[PDB]
Amino acid sequence: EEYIATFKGSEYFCYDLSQNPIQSSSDEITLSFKTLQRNGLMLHTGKSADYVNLALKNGAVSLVINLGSGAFEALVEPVNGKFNDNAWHDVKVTRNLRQVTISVDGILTTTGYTQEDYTMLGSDDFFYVGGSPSTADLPGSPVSNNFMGCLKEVVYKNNDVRLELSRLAKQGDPKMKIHGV
Protein backbone atom coordinates (compact mmCIF):
# COMPACT_ATOMS: atom_id res chain seq x y z
CA GLU A 1 0.00 0.00 0.00
CA GLU A 2 1.43 3.32 -1.14
CA TYR A 3 0.03 6.55 0.30
CA ILE A 4 -0.74 9.00 -2.46
CA ALA A 5 -2.09 12.49 -1.98
CA THR A 6 -3.36 14.80 -4.70
CA PHE A 7 -2.89 18.59 -4.50
CA LYS A 8 -4.78 21.03 -6.65
CA GLY A 9 -2.91 24.22 -5.77
CA SER A 10 -4.75 25.30 -2.61
CA GLU A 11 -4.05 22.34 -0.30
CA TYR A 12 -1.29 21.05 2.02
CA PHE A 13 -0.59 18.68 4.98
CA CYS A 14 0.71 20.19 8.16
CA TYR A 15 2.48 18.02 10.75
CA ASP A 16 2.91 19.69 14.14
CA LEU A 17 6.49 19.50 15.47
CA SER A 18 5.98 21.69 18.57
CA GLN A 19 5.90 18.81 21.05
CA ASN A 20 8.48 16.64 19.28
CA PRO A 21 11.02 19.01 17.74
CA ILE A 22 13.32 17.89 14.97
CA GLN A 23 16.91 17.90 16.31
CA SER A 24 19.01 16.14 13.73
CA SER A 25 22.66 15.93 12.64
CA SER A 26 21.80 13.61 9.75
CA ASP A 27 18.53 13.14 7.86
CA GLU A 28 16.97 11.38 4.94
CA ILE A 29 13.98 12.42 2.87
CA THR A 30 12.28 10.34 0.20
CA LEU A 31 9.11 10.90 -1.82
CA SER A 32 7.81 10.52 -5.33
CA PHE A 33 6.09 13.33 -7.23
CA LYS A 34 3.93 13.65 -10.37
CA THR A 35 3.00 17.00 -11.95
CA LEU A 36 2.37 19.03 -15.08
CA GLN A 37 3.39 22.28 -13.39
CA ARG A 38 6.81 23.94 -13.56
CA ASN A 39 6.60 25.35 -10.03
CA GLY A 40 5.33 23.96 -6.72
CA LEU A 41 6.30 23.32 -3.12
CA MET A 42 6.78 19.67 -2.35
CA LEU A 43 7.84 20.04 1.27
CA HIS A 44 9.18 22.40 3.91
CA THR A 45 10.14 22.52 7.53
CA GLY A 46 11.74 25.19 9.66
CA LYS A 47 11.93 28.93 10.27
CA SER A 48 14.67 31.54 10.71
CA ALA A 49 18.01 30.02 9.68
CA ASP A 50 17.24 26.27 10.16
CA TYR A 51 15.18 24.85 7.29
CA VAL A 52 14.70 22.35 4.54
CA ASN A 53 12.78 23.40 1.45
CA LEU A 54 11.98 21.05 -1.47
CA ALA A 55 10.23 22.30 -4.60
CA LEU A 56 9.98 22.11 -8.36
CA LYS A 57 11.37 25.40 -9.64
CA ASN A 58 10.97 26.10 -13.36
CA GLY A 59 10.88 22.33 -13.96
CA ALA A 60 13.97 21.49 -11.94
CA VAL A 61 14.07 19.84 -8.53
CA SER A 62 15.24 22.41 -6.01
CA LEU A 63 16.46 21.79 -2.51
CA VAL A 64 17.58 24.40 -0.05
CA ILE A 65 18.90 23.51 3.35
CA ASN A 66 20.31 25.69 6.09
CA LEU A 67 21.62 24.39 9.50
CA GLY A 68 21.97 27.85 10.98
CA SER A 69 25.32 28.94 9.56
CA GLY A 70 24.45 29.40 5.85
CA ALA A 71 22.35 27.71 3.18
CA PHE A 72 23.18 25.24 0.42
CA GLU A 73 21.00 25.32 -2.71
CA ALA A 74 20.97 22.23 -4.91
CA LEU A 75 19.23 22.06 -8.25
CA VAL A 76 18.64 18.91 -10.28
CA GLU A 77 17.87 19.48 -13.97
CA PRO A 78 16.19 16.91 -16.27
CA VAL A 79 18.16 15.50 -19.24
CA ASN A 80 15.72 13.81 -21.63
CA GLY A 81 12.29 15.40 -21.52
CA LYS A 82 10.92 16.91 -18.34
CA PHE A 83 10.15 16.29 -14.66
CA ASN A 84 6.74 18.00 -15.04
CA ASP A 85 5.67 15.32 -17.55
CA ASN A 86 3.00 13.81 -15.27
CA ALA A 87 5.01 10.60 -14.79
CA TRP A 88 6.21 9.64 -11.30
CA HIS A 89 9.71 10.72 -10.30
CA ASP A 90 11.49 9.54 -7.17
CA VAL A 91 13.40 11.96 -4.98
CA LYS A 92 15.96 11.15 -2.34
CA VAL A 93 17.73 13.64 -0.11
CA THR A 94 20.55 12.35 2.11
CA ARG A 95 22.31 14.56 4.61
CA ASN A 96 25.15 13.59 6.96
CA LEU A 97 26.16 16.57 9.06
CA ARG A 98 26.79 19.30 6.42
CA GLN A 99 27.09 16.94 3.43
CA VAL A 100 23.98 17.04 1.26
CA THR A 101 22.98 14.85 -1.66
CA ILE A 102 19.83 14.84 -3.69
CA SER A 103 19.05 12.31 -6.38
CA VAL A 104 16.13 12.17 -8.75
CA ASP A 105 15.16 8.91 -10.44
CA GLY A 106 18.32 7.33 -9.00
CA ILE A 107 20.67 8.66 -11.73
CA LEU A 108 20.39 12.49 -11.57
CA THR A 109 22.42 13.69 -8.60
CA THR A 110 23.61 17.02 -7.16
CA THR A 111 25.83 16.99 -4.09
CA GLY A 112 27.26 19.73 -1.83
CA TYR A 113 27.57 21.06 1.73
CA THR A 114 25.76 23.63 3.85
CA GLN A 115 27.97 26.55 4.82
CA GLU A 116 30.62 26.75 7.50
CA ASP A 117 30.36 24.77 10.72
CA TYR A 118 26.81 24.03 11.89
CA THR A 119 25.77 20.37 11.67
CA MET A 120 22.42 20.34 13.50
CA LEU A 121 18.96 21.00 12.02
CA GLY A 122 16.46 22.26 14.64
CA SER A 123 12.73 22.60 13.96
CA ASP A 124 9.74 22.76 16.33
CA ASP A 125 7.43 24.36 13.75
CA PHE A 126 5.55 22.30 11.16
CA PHE A 127 6.42 19.82 8.50
CA TYR A 128 4.57 21.08 5.38
CA VAL A 129 3.75 18.82 2.45
CA GLY A 130 2.28 19.98 -0.86
CA GLY A 131 2.14 23.66 0.17
CA SER A 132 1.78 25.98 3.16
CA PRO A 133 -0.28 29.02 4.34
CA SER A 134 2.12 31.34 2.52
CA THR A 135 4.69 29.55 0.41
CA ALA A 136 6.45 32.68 -0.96
CA ASP A 137 7.44 33.61 2.61
CA LEU A 138 8.92 30.31 3.62
CA PRO A 139 12.66 30.58 4.28
CA GLY A 140 14.69 29.39 1.31
CA SER A 141 11.66 28.92 -0.96
CA PRO A 142 12.30 29.71 -4.67
CA VAL A 143 8.56 29.49 -5.46
CA SER A 144 5.23 30.87 -4.29
CA ASN A 145 3.03 28.08 -5.70
CA ASN A 146 1.68 25.26 -3.60
CA PHE A 147 2.02 21.92 -5.37
CA MET A 148 -0.44 20.94 -8.10
CA GLY A 149 0.00 17.24 -8.68
CA CYS A 150 0.51 14.09 -6.65
CA LEU A 151 2.99 13.28 -3.91
CA LYS A 152 3.47 9.79 -2.48
CA GLU A 153 5.49 8.01 0.17
CA VAL A 154 6.79 11.16 1.81
CA VAL A 155 9.14 10.05 4.57
CA TYR A 156 11.44 12.09 6.76
CA LYS A 157 13.74 10.13 9.01
CA ASN A 158 16.78 10.57 11.20
CA ASN A 159 18.43 8.25 13.72
CA ASP A 160 15.77 8.99 16.36
CA VAL A 161 12.51 9.41 14.42
CA ARG A 162 10.74 8.17 11.28
CA LEU A 163 7.90 10.39 10.03
CA GLU A 164 5.78 8.62 7.42
CA LEU A 165 4.08 11.87 6.45
CA SER A 166 2.03 10.48 3.51
CA ARG A 167 0.85 7.53 5.61
CA LEU A 168 0.00 9.87 8.52
CA ALA A 169 -2.02 12.21 6.27
CA LYS A 170 -3.97 9.26 4.89
CA GLN A 171 -4.41 7.28 8.10
CA GLY A 172 -4.85 10.24 10.49
CA ASP A 173 -2.90 11.55 13.51
CA PRO A 174 -3.53 14.08 16.34
CA LYS A 175 -0.53 16.11 15.06
CA MET A 176 -1.45 15.81 11.36
CA LYS A 177 -3.83 18.33 9.74
CA ILE A 178 -5.04 18.65 6.16
CA HIS A 179 -5.84 22.10 4.85
CA GLY A 180 -7.67 23.03 1.66
CA VAL A 181 -9.11 26.35 0.52
Ligand SMILES: [Ca+2]
Ligand atom coordinates in the same frame (compact mmCIF):
# COMPACT_ATOMS: atom_id res chain seq x y z
CA1 LIG B 1 21.15 24.42 13.63
